[PDB]
Amino acid sequence: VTQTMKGLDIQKVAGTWYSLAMAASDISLLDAQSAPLRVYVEELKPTPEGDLEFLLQKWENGECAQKKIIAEKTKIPAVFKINKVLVLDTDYKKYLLFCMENSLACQCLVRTPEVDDEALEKFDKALKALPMHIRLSFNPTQLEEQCHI
Amino acid sequence: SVTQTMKGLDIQKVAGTWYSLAMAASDISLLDAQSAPLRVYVEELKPTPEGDLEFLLQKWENGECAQKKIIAEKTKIPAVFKIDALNENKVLVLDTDYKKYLLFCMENQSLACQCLVRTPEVDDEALEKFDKALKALPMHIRLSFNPTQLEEQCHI
């Protein structure tokens, strides 16, 4: 992943998000509820030091676990270290596109638990240069359920 | 569910070798596991003397790769077939050029579609036409397979 967001203002990504769609380089990264990169972003909280706190849900040992993880800033405003987190694009008010790279998985986040045509079209365009072998998308009912069940 | 069928399908010309390059389904659970209900790999098509279409496929069953044969019976629409199985179903051929790619769906309402290729290689045209076809359909999971997997039992 090289195409990261120019001019990111991380403070404007604060608040609630919903994982609408995800894609990964390897089927095993996303295929099961327990798959390693099957994670649902529920909130982003930029820190006073310019780090990025993720609140996510992840299926572990038969429960939907909530995790709070700090992604530490790097010299590239759009790149953090949790894996590298790369923010490809956001309009702050509607969508955010990011990837996790070690293996590669990318997500389309939306501000409201609804399908957004613009967000998904931009996600598809961003994935054209990336060697993805699994793509998932979630319905509005799933977005509001613990671990998108 | 599926609006697009192949006009003027000649089932004799779809006969022979195929490989499942990509698949997509309306419900993640139809395709997410090696054991998922619509996770099947088409290896060969055989038209019958009655104009039915026999699918020779691989399916993960009892933790091993099994060979299975499924007859999709002809209907009054050339590109639409029906498997004698408990559940109401349709097999729909969306598009083929016969010599490189074939796009089909299974409707059960559950829906899964596949991109078949003649040669066990990633084909840009096959995948681009598959993706265009899927824009019309409410898919929540898409898988694609590397050329090594195409020639392994059950795409392992």
Ligand SMILES: CCCCNc1ccc(C(=O)OCCN(C)C)cc1
């Ligand atoms: C650049 C403007 C940043 C303003 N911040 C926000 C603006 C909007 C939202 C938000 O969630 O809006 C959803 C409603 N649709 C119409 C936008 C969340 C944060």
